[PDB]
Design a protein around this ligand. Structure first.
Ligand SMILES: NC(=O)c1ccc[n+]([C@@H]2O[C@H](COP(=O)([O-])OP(=O)(O)OC[C@H]3O[C@@H](n4cnc5c(N)ncnc54)[C@H](OP(=O)(O)O)[C@@H]3O)[C@@H](O)[C@H]2O)c1
Ligand SMILES: O=C(O)COc1cc(Cl)ccc1C(=O)NCc1c(F)cc(Br)cc1F
Length: 316
């Protein structure tokens, strides 16, 4: 299987990338350096992760060392919810560019479909704990994203955590100039996403799977939640293939024509997670993994559930 997938902007995107949410700032520079050394060419970032400066130090060092050329890297970031307004989008993108020490992003995503009140706080709340919306909508935010392409700041634009109706709304936007290249969504054997993936793929939108290992370090994990990495059914498939459970979990989305972005700051795991291009899951393995769906989400957030554009009320 090829290492990159063709996007609807004409560029190629590496199907494996390194995630950076929760990567501590004192560890992520080395993590990204190791990743690039062992073959990663795609890094998934976001302003809200609060570590783009440190990710950028690694990228810049590897460019300066001439380990890789800029054209060989595929750097992704995301516009946070408090920057959906017309007059804030460019500055938000530019702050990310400055922190990452780049002159362009390969892909810039609307992080969530919901706009929040601008200000210092990433999650502005009312006194009862509900997020405070902005009156921005996904269509006007999309137009602002299109401007970034036309200014040379980003090579591609896309969306993240958009449900099927929201994707449809973008595709049906009056005067749409650029289609979204990517929809980045949670996807793993407990949240298999057949409906939304099929829809996006049918429209030429590439899907990126986040939390492919079930995000065991998510800060809201409960001791009782289901655990992909410990599921004996998945362990059995891994054992049959002489691979680790994590390697199976990463290979799974790859064979569905998805991009996948496992996170690690552990050098041995960063390397392990990249060693997924030399084995194949059978069709039976794939269908078996799909059968584990239980509609379980890592990423959901009670404080945001009443926002008009919160994505997870719809079935898909
Ligand atoms: N667009 C969005 O809204 C959104 C939401 C969630 C995630 N994302 C992106 O997707 C990335 C991945 O998702 P995620 O961070 O939620 O979780 P994940 O990649 O599913 O899991 C990361 C966890 O798995 C551990 N791990 C990594 N490789 C392992 C291996 N080979 N064996 C055992 N454990 C391993 C990591 O530990 P160590 O790091 O300690 O090794 C970390 O605790 C994020 O970092 C972010 O870039 C985007
Ligand atoms: O959103 C992500 O990329 C990962 O999750 C988070 C990362 C940070 Cl730095 C802070 C918060 C979260 C989180 O709570 N994510 C879930 C979440 C939203 F952040 C925002 C909305 Br809208 C819905 C939702 F489920």
């Amino acid at each position: 299987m090829a290492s990159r997938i063709l996007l609807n902007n004409g560029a190629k995107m590496p199907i494996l990338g390194l995630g950076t949410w929760k990567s501590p700032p004192g560890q992520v520079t080395e993590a990204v350096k190791v990743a690039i050394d062992v073959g990663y060419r795609h890094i998934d970032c976001a302003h809200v992760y609060q570590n783009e400066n440190e990710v950028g130090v690694a990228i810049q060092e590897k460019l300066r060392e001439q380990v890789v050329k800029r054209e060989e890297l595929f750097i992704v970031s995301k516009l946070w919810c408090t920057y959906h307004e017309k007059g804030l989008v460019k500055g938000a993108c530019q702050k990310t560019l400055s922190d990452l020490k780049l002159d362009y992003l390969d892909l810039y995503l609307i992080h969530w479909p919901t706009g929040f009140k601008p200000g210092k706080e990433f999650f502005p709340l009312d006194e009862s704990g509900n997020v405070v919306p902005s009156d921005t909508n996904i269509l006007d935010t999309w137009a602002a994203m299109e401007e970034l392409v036309d200014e040379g700041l980003v090579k591609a634009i896309g969306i993240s955590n958009f449900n099927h109706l929201q994707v449809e709304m973008i595709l049906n936007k009056p005067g749409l100039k650029y289609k979204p290249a990517v929809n980045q969504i949670e996807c793993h054997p407990y949240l298999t996403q057949e409906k939304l993936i099929q829809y996006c793929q049918s429209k030429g939108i590439v899907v990126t799977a986040y939390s492919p290992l079930g995000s065991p370090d998510r800060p809201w994990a409960k001791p009782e939640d289901p655990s992909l990495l410990e599921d004996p059914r998945i362990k059995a498939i891994a054992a049959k293939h002489n691979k680790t459970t994590a390697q199976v979990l990463i290979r799974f989305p790859m064979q569905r024509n998805l991009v996948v972005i496992p996170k690690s700051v552990t050098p041995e795991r960063i390397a392990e997670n990249f060693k997924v291009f030399d084995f194949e899951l059978s069709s039976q393995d794939m269908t078996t993994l799909l059968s584990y769906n239980r509609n379980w989400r890592v990423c959901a957030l009670l404080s945001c559930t009443s926002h008009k554009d919160y994505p997870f009320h719809e079935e898909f």
